[PDB]
Amino acid sequence: GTILIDLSPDDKEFQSVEEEMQSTVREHFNRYNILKIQKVCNKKLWERYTHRRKEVSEENHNHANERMLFHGSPFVNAIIHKGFDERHAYIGGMFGAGIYFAENSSKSNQYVYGISCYICHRQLLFCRVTLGKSFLQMAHSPPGHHSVTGRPLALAEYVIYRGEQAYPEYLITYQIMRPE
């Protein structure tokens, strides 16, 4: 029961997600061509998220440690309908078998087509992620912990090992803009 709410570029919510998308771009293109920012409204994927959010709160001194983070994966189209699913994690990842996020849109943009075209439209997710007690760096969370924060330039990555601790709130259809 997923319904996509298309946001007007004149809407404060659109501009918020637009600036957050554009301002978090670093260099390893310069700016993005933001085409479509849609809200993801699924009552069951939401009640599943919030239920888990409260579980983590009670295990972390009444602090969910919630963050808005970007996500890229070949599974975006499936995620918005079936929710995040740790079962589809990669066994050999640097931080084990978890779902990867980043606070830089440009980081998540790397993982859109698995692990240089200006024409083909891309999609990222801008998600609510419950980090809870994040371990600074494997199969699951370490004991007493709910997420992994990594920092391998030195760009921050965040990994969860339970699909229900993230909700794909915004679907951003965009292109990387050609440097003039």
Numbering used by the authors: 952 to 979, 989 to 1075, 1088 to 1109, 1115 to 1129, 1134 to 1161
Copy out sentences from the published article reporting this entry, exactly as the authors wrote them.
Tankyrases are ADP-ribosylating enzymes that regulate many physiological processes in the cell and are considered promising drug targets for cancer and fibrotic diseases. The ART domain of TNKSs is located at the C-terminus and catalyses the PARylation of substrate proteins. When the first crystal structure of human TNKS1 was determined, it surprisingly revealed a zinc-binding motif present in the catalytic domain located about 20 Å from the NAD+-binding pocket. The zinc-binding Cys-His-Cys-Cys-type motif is located within a loop region of 12 consecutive residues in the ART domain of TNKS1 and TNKS2 and does not structurally resemble known zinc-finger motifs; however, the fold can be classified as a short zinc-binding loop.
As alternative strategy, we crystallized the wild-type of the TNKS2 ART domain and attempted to remove the zinc from the crystals. Treatment with H2O2 of TNKS2 crystals that were co-crystallized with our previously reported TNKS inhibitor OM-1700 did not significantly lower diffraction quality. While lower concentrations of H2O2 showed only partial loss of the zinc ion, incubation of the crystals with 25 mM H2O2 for 48 h showed complete loss of electron density corresponding to the zinc ion in the crystal structure. When compared to the structure of non-treated crystals, the structure of H2O2 treated crystals showed loss of electron density for the zinc ion and of several protein regions nearby. Interestingly, residues Gly1076-Arg1087 connecting from the zinc-binding motif up to the Ile1075 located in the G-loop could not be modelled after H2O2 treatment, indicating increased flexibility of this region. Although many of residues in this region are glycines, they form a helical structural element with a defined hydrogen bonding network in TNKSs when the zinc-binding motif is intact. Additionally, the residues Arg980-Ile988 also showed loss of electron density in chain A of the H2O2-treated sample. This region is located close to the zinc-binding motif and under native conditions is connected by hydrogen bonds to Ser1088 and Arg1087. Electron density for this region was present in chain B, likely due to nearby crystal contacts preventing flexibility. Apart from these unmodelled regions connected to the zinc-binding motif, the modelled regions of the two structures showed no obvious differences (root-mean-square deviation = 0.75 Å).
